[PDB]
Structures are given as structure tokens and as C-alpha cells.
């Protein structure tokens, strides 16, 4: 009807979803209310200005921001000087989602740079001359598969990369992030991602890894960084994505995990929190909502007959609403929440989540949902590697025509 | 010594005691990608760091240089590895190194390497005697700092420091009953000390959590805790719990109580309860109340649950097709 509001965040009922603090004020509730107050200004801004809402993804603005950062960053990024393959992966993957070609001159310069970040003893480091580390190693292998040229694939020293991985493997089944480093579930995801993309998985590489990851699922149904720690979206994506790679998702209690992640969507704001009783953040649009296609595929692999054949099990509309209305910066780039500044990290994962929420697919069943103008539609992303599905196929098909090192 | 923020700080290229060393520029290649336009101070420190690292110079001046490098980027794990090499080679006082790390964590506590380094010191010294109080200070400024709580769990478990943690837990729930890290810490302490299989502890914990729910009925952490400690034995193995929650329905209701009732029903149906079809209808009704009115953000979830329940617990579900 004509009194009907199509935007979920703007309906009158939606006011009822505001925080109920039971007249018990604590820091958690105060901080939650402050965000809901700021978000409500965003939602009401159309009404108060007497405009009709248009939800427009500022493609041209983000492209300019991405295109330039791929070449040069301000000293604001000194804090990421040991994460430069990450900057490569985030920017390349945002451009990919925005369906922006990667010039063959940019592709080869990236290849030359990650080559300089590669360690003579396997793995990649956060920059040239740095020691290797599983996190810049996962990012470099991803960025190299996004380029996906013959040149890009050959940067990877597969023989040494497998040597590096073995040197971090722990007896309880976990991995170190780097030599002398810490152990948490990020290393399991990082190791399995590069190892499966490049085809270097051996029969004993991940012995006991599935079992270690499962010990990280706690009483909440999510996954903590190490056994006993609070469940978090980033660790839970890492933990479940790693098991999907290892074909061991059934090690987890998938029901209590599904129940956990769907409760991390915020009834008012529409995006996701990283953990119970914390604040909404646009980057969990990927880390949390990305967990639902992985869950969908696992339960469908067990013949769960009740699965939807058209939607993920979260509020896809509400999440696109939050990203489009709240996480876009008018100069380009996306961001955490209104009032925070932009950065390539949130740019990558706000758009990765937007893409997840836009595209459902389980076999031949495809169904898209594009809030706002139809040009907002992004390229699909693969929910295990968060690189374009075409790039995963192209990379694995390439590396499967090599032998696993040592045969 | 000269602190990185000192007004009289001088660049390393201007220091006479560094004149023998040639700095090493970053090897970024002929046409760089993602090139950061470093400040003078930053590029200066890391040019000289690259040099000592390339030599493997295990000198006192190098040890002081890694302090400056760490303050400019405390996520540089390479600089941290070298600092630990120098700590052992130069035989540095590790309590003086602990005074350093308590300070660095104070100023940048949201970072992986600072906390890992503290853990290595504690293992080297085999001395946890400062940990619980220091962590308590970090938590007094951010009661939800993930690395702080991870570090606290390691110290407690590795040095068997369980004695006073449930009391610390109780203090922080008093301060913020919505602090989900504290509910998790509460489950950690019990899981490793008495366990929840002791019937008195479990009862005490359920009584405690209900008392909390009664006070802040929309606090989701108390609800998740209550489900977590009971879901392992099976929510239907506690017959009284259902009626007790229904007794909160009028004056303490939330979507969290509605959802718990669906959870009890789901498990009752999975355990072949009496009035099977009656229970299935109560559950299906709550799923639609939650999907349509009470918890609409999760409509795809509650609808999926309603289909799951119908799929395997309807009276027709066990019945052959030909019937
Ligand atoms: C422009 C800087 C972005 C900071 C962001 C990303 N970030 C990071 C740095 C290098 C690699 C990497 O890997 C990746 F991308 F996460 F996979 C992540 C950090 O360290 C801090 N973060 C702060 C943040 C923002 N929103 C939630 N948080 C908490 C958080 C904690 C740990 C992780 Br780990 C990820 C997130
Ligand atoms: C390498 C890889 C795949 C990484 C993904 C993992 C990821 C996003 C992890 C988050 C880990 C963490 C300490 C979060 C808490 O930060 P916070 O407390 O500052 O933020 P919060 O309040 O939102 O939890
Ligand atoms: Zn974020």
C-alpha cells in the first residue's frame, strides 16, 4: 500500500526494537543506547529532511578511494606496516566485488611486491624483509589468486610454503601464527586456506586440527580464539571455515552455533555485533553473516529438509540497510559505524558482507535480493576464502595440475 | 636513552653513536603497490632497524632501538622477535623488561604481540605473582578486552590460580551484569574447578542466574549462560524449569524467554515427551510469534526452526507415504 514503508529500518514498528535497559544502567547499556541514538538520527534523517530514501552504493567514490590506496597510503597506515599483503588483499578484493578490472600493470607490480614479501624459508611477511607470518601469508595467497594470472600463481613457493606450515604445527593440532608467536584459531584457518588453494595438503598436515578447533566452541555455541575464551565472530568464521576446508564441520555442534550467530544480528541497527552485549560493526557483516552460507551448506550436506531454498538464515534486507545507510563514507570507503572514519579493512568486509546478503545460492537454486537501486549489486564472494568464486575454481584447478610437494 | 615522544628526541641519522652504521632502506621494488608514505621519525627508526637486523647486531644500542620501533608499530612481530633475541643474548634483566611491558600494554592494550611477549616473560621468569593484579588494572579501563581475558585464563590455568577468581567474577558482574566476558570467565572457573556435574554447584548457578534474569530480564548474557549450563544435560531433563519460566512470562517477558521456551519444547520433542502433538503446537505458535512479532530480525531462523519441528515431530512424520 501507499502508507507502507519498504525499508525495514524505517517502518513504525521498528521503533519498538530499541534497547530496553530495565531501568538498570550499566556501561554496556549506556554504550548500546548511545549507538542506537546515533543510528536513529541516520534512519530519521530522510523523514526530518522530507526526502524520499534512496539507498545508493557510492561505487564511483569507493573506486577512487580503492584505486589510489592500491598505490599509496598516508602515514595513517604506519600501524599496518607489518600487514601490507593485507592491504593488497582488502583493496584488490573490494575492487573485485565492485567489478573493477585489475590492470595488467597493477597485477604485475603486485606480483613483484608479494615476491619481495615472500620468505626464503616459506610463507610471506608483512612487508619486504620481514619474517613470515600466517596472516600476511593468507592475505598474499588470496591477493595472488584474485589476480589469478599465470605470473601470480608462480610467485608462490609451494615446496617451501609447506615447509613453513609444518614448522608451525603444534602437537595438540593447533598452529603458531609465526615462529615464536601465539596460537589461536586464526592460524588454523590461515594454514588450511593457503594449503587447499595451492594443493599442498598432505595426509598428516592437519592431524588433530579439526579436534583442536572443536575444543574452541564454548558454552555460547560460537568459537573463541583458544579453548575457554569468549565466542567471537572473527574466530567463529575462522573455526567453521577451516573445518569446511577439512570436511570436518560435523565436529562442531552446528545447531548451537547457528543459534549463536543469528543472535548476533542487532534487532534495531540491522548489522552484527562481534560478541554478545557489544556494539554493532560493519565488518561483522562478513565475519558473522558469512557464517550462514557455511552453515547452510553443512546442514544441506546432512540432508536437513527444512532449509530455505531462497534465503540465508539472517535478515538479509536489514543488513543491506545497515551497510548502505550507515557504513558508507561520502568520500569513498566504508566503515564500522556512524562516527568512525573509513579504512580499507572495513571497506573490504562491509562490501564482502553486502555481497553475501545480496546473493543466495544452494546448487541450481539462486535468488538475489538487492536493496536500493539495482546497480548496488556486487559480484559474489566465496564464503570460505572471501575471494570471488571464479577465482577459487581457477586457482584450485591450476594447482591441482601440480603434484603435492614430495609427492 | 631517549623516549620516542620526548621533545628532545633526535633522529637516529643525527646520533653520533650511530655514525658507523649505514641505514638500510625498505626494499619496495621499482614501482611499489600499497606504499605507505612514512613520517620522518618512522622511516628513520625502521631504516636503522633494518640495518641492525641484517647484521644480526646483538648490541645494547640495538636493544634500545627496538623499543622505538615497537612504539611506532607495536604490531611488528619481526621487531618483537629480535627484541627477545637481544633479551637473551645480552642477558637483560627480565623484571626490568616486565616493567617495560606493563607500560606498553597500558598504552596499547588492543594488540596481539604485547600480550604474547608478556606471556613469554612470565614463562621465562616462571613468576605469575603480578599477573592477576595487572590484568585487573587493564580490565578496570576496558572490562571486555579480549587479550586481557585470554591472558588471565592462561595465567590462572597454568599456575593453578583458581582460588579467588569466582570472587573476582562476582565483583565484575556486580559492576556490569551485561559483561559477557565475565559470564564466560564464570563458566571457565567452574568448568575447571568443580564442574557443573556437582548438583549443588549447578543448582547454585541456576538460582543465581534466574535471580539475575529477574533483575535485568532483557540482559541476554544471563539467558545464554542459563542455556549453556543446562543444554548439555538436556533442557528437558529439568522438568521444573519450564513452569518456572512461564511464571516469569507476565512481568519479566522478553524475546529471550519466548526463545528459551521453544528451546525447551524442541528438546522435549526430541526425547519423546507426553502430549507430543500438544507440545509441537505450542512450539510452532511461539516460532511464529517470534518470527512475525517478537523477534522479527531472526524471521528466517524461527521459520526454519518451525519447519524443522514440523519436519520430524508431526504425527504424519513417522507415517508412510501410502498411508
Ligand atoms: C585499518 C585497521 C583496521 C583495524 C582492525 C583490523 N585488524 C587487522 C589487522 C591486520 C590483519 C587483519 O586480518 C583480518 F583482516 F582481520 F582478517 C586484521 C586489527 O588488528 C584491528 N582491527 C580492529 C577492528 C575493527 N573492527 C573490529 N576490530 C577488532 C579486530 C581485532 C583483531 C582482528 Br585480527 C580483527 C579485528
Ligand atoms: C586472520 C583472520 C581471518 C582474522 C579474522 C579474525 C577476527 C575478525 C578476529 C577478532 C579477534 C578479536 C580480538 C576481536 C576483539 O576485538 P575488539 O574487542 O576491539 O572488537 P569487538 O568489541 O567488536 O569484539
Ligand atoms: Zn570492525
Cβ neighbours of residue A14 closer than 8 Å, sequence gap 6 or more: A8, A43, A268
Cβ atoms of residues A369 and A355 within 8 Å = no
CA R_g for chain B: 29
A125: β partners? A132
Q: For chain A, report the end-to-end CA distance as a whole number of angstroms.
A: 66
- In the reported structure, the alpha carbon of residue A284 is separated from the centroid of ligand 2 by a whole-number distance in angstroms of 9
Closest approach atom of ligand 2 to CA A275: 24
Q: Tell me which DSSP letter residue A272 carries.
A: B
Interface of A with B in 11-40 (CB under 8 A): 13, 17, 19-22, 24, 26-29
DSSP for A193-231, please give it. HHHHHTT---TTTTTTHHHHHHHTB-TTSSB-SSTTSPP
Closest approach atom of ligand 2 to CA B146: 13
User: Quick check: B224 and A220 CB within 8 A?
Assistant: yes
How many angstroms separate the Cα of B16 from the Cα of each of A387, B3, B10, B45, B55? Answer: 50, 17, 11, 15, 19
- Rounded distance, CA B247 to CA A393, Å? 55
Cβ neighbours of residue A270 closer than 8 Å, sequence gap 6 or more: A8, A9, A315, A318, A319, A321, A322, B297
**Any alpha helices (H) in A263-360, and if so which ranges?**
284-287, 291-301, 316-326, 344-358
Between strands B35-36 and A72-73, the pairing is parallel
Cα-flanking dihedrals φ and ψ of residue B124, to 5°? -65, -50
What are the contacts of B15-21 at 24+ separation with CB within 8 A? B17/B61, B18/B48, B18/B61, B21/B48, B21/B51, B21/B52, B21/B57
> Residue A22 burial by CB count (10 A; 0-12/13-18/19+): exposed, middle or buried?
middle
Task: Return the SS3 of B245.
Answer: helix
Domains held by chain B: number: 1
* Residue ranges making up the domain that contains B226: 1-323
Domains held by chain A: number: 1
- In the reported structure, the alpha carbon of residue A263 is separated from the centroid of ligand 3 by a whole-number distance in angstroms of 18
Cβ atoms of residues A214 and A181 within 8 Å = no
Q: Is A178 in the pocket of ligand 2 (CB under 6 A)?
A: no
Name the strand (E) or helix (H) holding A265: none
Cβ neighbours of residue B7 closer than 8 Å, sequence gap 6 or more: none
Name the strand (E) or helix (H) holding A315: none
* Set of cell numbers at residue B113: 604481540
* Set of cell numbers at residue B123: 614463562
Interface of A with B in 362-401 (CB under 8 A): none
Cα-flanking dihedrals φ and ψ of residue A341, to 5°? -95, 160
Mutate to test the pocket of ligand 2, among B111, B141, B142, B146 (most ligand atoms within 8 A of CB): B146
Instruction: Categorise residue A25: left if φ over 0, alpha if ψ from -120 to 50, beta otherwise.
Output: beta
- Rounded distance, CA B206 to CA B216, Å? 15
Nearest to A187, CA basis, from A211, A169, A205, A160: A169
Within 8 A of B24 by CB-CB distance, chain A residues are: 129
Using CB atoms, pick whichever of B157, B178, B296 lies closest to residue A28. Answer: B178
* Residue ranges making up the domain that contains A92: 1-407
On the CB side of A328, CA atoms within 13 Å amount to 21
Closest CA–CA distance from residue B206 to any residue of chain A (Å)? 15
- In the reported structure, the alpha carbon of residue A142 is separated from the centroid of ligand 3 by a whole-number distance in angstroms of 20
Nearest to A129, CA basis, from A120, A138, A137: A120
> Residue A50 burial by CB count (10 A; 0-12/13-18/19+): exposed, middle or buried?
exposed
- Rounded distance, CA B245 to CA B257, Å? 7
- Rounded distance, CA B217 to CA A327, Å? 31
Nearest to A225, CA basis, from B291, B129, B147: B147
How many angstroms separate the Cα of B218 from the Cα of each of A24, A277, B206, B252, B258? Answer: 10, 11, 17, 8, 12
> Residue A364 burial by CB count (10 A; 0-12/13-18/19+): exposed, middle or buried?
exposed
- Rounded distance, CA A384 to CA A295, Å? 11
Cβ atoms of residues A137 and A194 within 8 Å = yes
User: Quick check: B26 and A128 CB within 8 A?
Assistant: yes
- Rounded distance, CA B87 to CA B54, Å? 18
E-only strand ranges, chain B: 35-36
How many angstroms separate the Cα of A325 from the Cα of each of A32, A209, A322? Answer: 19, 40, 5
Using CB atoms, pick whichever of B29, B221, B225 lies closest to residue A112. Answer: B29
A366: β partners? A361
- Rounded distance, CA B245 to CA B248, Å? 5
- Rounded distance, CA A52 to CA B124, Å? 64
Cβ neighbours of residue B100 closer than 8 Å, sequence gap 6 or more: B67
User: Quick check: A275 and B180 CB within 8 A?
Assistant: yes
Pick the residue whose CA is nearest to atom 16 on ligand 2: B146
Query: With the CA atoms of B192, B193, B195 and B200 taken in that order, what torsion angle do they form, in degrees rounded to the nearest 10?
Result: -160
Residue matched to cell numbers 640495538:
B62
The experimental resolution of this structure, in angstroms, equals: 2.8
Catalytic residues of B: 110
Pick the residue whose CA is nearest to atom 22 on ligand 1: A345
Cβ atoms of residues A119 and A127 within 8 Å = no
Nearest to A288, CA basis, from A351, A222, A242: A222
How many angstroms separate the Cα of B215 from the Cα of each of B64, B184, B218, B318? Answer: 53, 19, 9, 44
B141 C-beta neighbours (distance < 10 Å), count:
10
Amino acid at each position: 500500500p501507499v502508507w507502507s514503508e519498504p525499508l525495514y529500518s524505517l517502518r513504525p514498528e521498528h521503533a519498538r526494537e530499541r534497547l530496553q535497559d530495565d531501568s538498570v544502567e550499566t556501561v554496556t547499556s549506556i554504550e548500546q543506547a548511545k549507538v542506537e541514538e546515533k543510528i536513529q538520527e541516520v534512519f530519521s534523517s530522510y523523514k526530518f529532511n522530507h526526502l524520499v530514501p534512496r539507498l545508493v552504493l557510492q561505487r564511483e567514490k569507493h573506486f577512487h578511494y580503492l584505486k589510489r590506496g592500491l598505490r599509496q597510503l598516508t602515514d595513517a597506515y604506519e600501524c599496518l606496516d607489518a600487514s601490507r599483503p593485507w592491504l593488497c588483499y582488502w583493496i584488490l578484493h573490494s575492487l573485485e566485488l565492485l567489478d573493477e578490472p585489475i590492470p595488467q600493470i597493477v597485477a604485475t607490480d603486485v606480483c613483484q611486491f608479494l615476491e619481495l614479501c615472500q620468505s626464503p624459508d616459506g610463507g610471506f611477511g608483512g612487508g619486504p624483509g620481514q619474517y613470515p607470518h600466517l596472516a600476511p601469508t593468507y592475505a598474499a595467497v588470496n591477493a595472488l589468486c584474485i589476480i589469478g594470472t599465470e605470473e601470480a600463481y608462480n610467485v608462490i613457493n609451494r615446496e617451501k610454503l609447506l615447509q613453513y606450515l609444518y614448522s608451525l604445527k603444534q602437537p595438540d593440532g593447533s598452529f603458531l601464527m609465526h615462529v615464536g608467536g601465539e596460537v589461536d584459531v586464526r592460524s588454523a584457518y590461515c594454514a588450511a586456506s593457503v594449503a587447499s588453494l595451492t594443493n599442498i595438503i598432505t595426509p598428516d598436515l592437519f592431524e588433530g586440527t579439526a579436534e583442536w578447533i572443536a575444543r574452541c566452541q564454548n558454552w555460547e555455541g560460537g568459537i573463541g580464539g583458544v579453548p575457554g575464551m569468549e565466542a567471537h565472530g572473527g574466530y567463529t568464521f575462522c573455526g567453521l571455515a577451516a573445518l569446511v576446508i577439512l570436511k570436518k564441520e560435523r565436529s562442531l555442534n552446528l545447531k548451537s552455533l547457528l543459534q549463536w550467530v543469528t543472535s548476533r544480528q542487532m534487532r534495531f541497527e540491522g548489522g552484527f555485533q562481534g560478541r554478545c552485549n557489544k556494539l554493532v560493526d560493519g565488518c561483522y557483516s562478513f565475519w558473522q553473516a558469512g557464517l550462514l552460507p557455511l552453515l547452510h551448506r553443512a546442514l544441506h550436506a546432512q540432508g536437513d529438509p527444512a532449509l530455505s531454498m531462497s534465503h540465508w538464515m539472517f535478515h538479509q534486507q536489514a543488513l543491506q540497510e545497515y551497510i548502505l545507510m550507515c557504513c558508507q563514507c561520502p568520500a569513498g570507503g566504508l566503515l564500522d559505524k556512524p562516527g568512525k572514519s573509513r579504512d580499507f579493512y572495513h571497506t573490504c568486509y562491509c562490501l564482502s558482507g553486502l555481497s553475501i546478503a545480496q546473493h543466495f545460492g544452494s546448487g541450481a537454486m539462486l535468488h538475489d535480493v538487492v536493496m536500493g537501486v539495482p546497480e548496488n549489486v556486487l559480484q559474489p564472494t566465496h564464503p570460505v576464502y572471501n575471494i570471488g568464486p571464479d577465482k577459487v575454481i581457477q586457482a584450485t584447478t591450476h594447482f591441482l595440475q601440480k603434484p603435492v610437494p614430495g609427492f | 636513552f631517549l623516549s620516542l615522544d620526548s621533545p628532545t628526541y633526535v633522529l637516529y641519522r643525527d646520533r653520533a653513536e650511530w655514525a658507523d652504521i649505514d641505514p638500510v632502506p625498505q626494499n619496495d621494488g621499482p614501482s611499489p603497490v600499497v606504499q605507505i608514505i612514512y613520517s620522518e621519525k618512522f622511516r628513520d627508526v625502521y631504516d636503522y632497524f633494518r640495518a641492525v637486523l641484517q647484521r644480526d647486531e646483538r648490541s645494547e644500542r640495538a636493544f634500545k632501538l627496538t623499543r622505538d620501533a615497537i612504539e611506532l608499530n607495536a604490531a611488528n612481530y619481526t621487531v618483537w622477535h629480535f627484541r627477545r633475541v637481544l633479551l637473551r643474548s645480552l642477558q637483560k634483566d627480565l623484571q626490568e623488561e616486565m616493567n617495560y611491558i606493563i607500560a606498553i600494554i597500558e598504552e596499547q592494550p588492543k594488540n596481539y604481540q604485547v600480550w604474547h611477549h608478556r606471556r613469554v616473560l612470565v614463562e621465562w621468569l616462571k613468576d605469575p605473582s603480578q599477573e592477576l593484579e595487572f590484568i585487573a588494572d587493564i580490565l578496570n579501563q576496558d572490562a571486555k578486552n579480549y587479550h586481557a581475558w585470554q591472558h588471565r585464563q592462561w595465567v590462572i590455568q597454568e599456575f593453578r590460580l583458581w582460588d579467588n577468581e569466582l570472587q573476582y567474577v562476582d565483583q565484575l558482574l556486580k559492576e556490569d551484569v551485561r559483561n559477557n566476558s565475565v559470564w564466560n570467565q564464570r563458566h571457565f572457573v567452574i568448568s575447571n574447578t568443580t564442574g557443573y556435574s556437582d548438583r549443588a554447584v549447578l543448582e547454585r548457578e541456576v538460582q543465581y542466574t534466574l535471580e539475575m534474569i529477574k533483575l535485568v530480564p532483557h540482559n541476554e548474557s544471563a539467558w545464554n549462560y542459563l542455556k549453556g549450563i543446562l543444554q548439555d544435560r538436556g533442557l528437558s531433563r529439568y522438568p521444573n524449569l519450564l513452569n518456572q519460566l512461564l511464571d516469569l512470562q507476565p512481568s519479566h517477558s522478553s524475546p529471550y524467554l519466548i526463545a528459551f521456551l521453544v528451546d525447551i519444547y524442541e528438546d522435549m520433542l526430541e526425547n519423546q515427551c507426553d502430549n507430543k502433538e500438544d507440545i509441537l503446537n505450542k512450539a510452532l505458535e511461539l516460532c511464529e510469534i517470534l518470527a512475525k512479532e517478537k523477534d522479527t530480525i531472526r524471521k528466517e531462523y524461527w521459520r526454519y526452526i518451525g519447519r524443522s519441528l514440523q519436519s520430524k515431530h508431526s504425527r504424519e512424520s513417522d507415517i508412510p507415504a501410502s498411508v
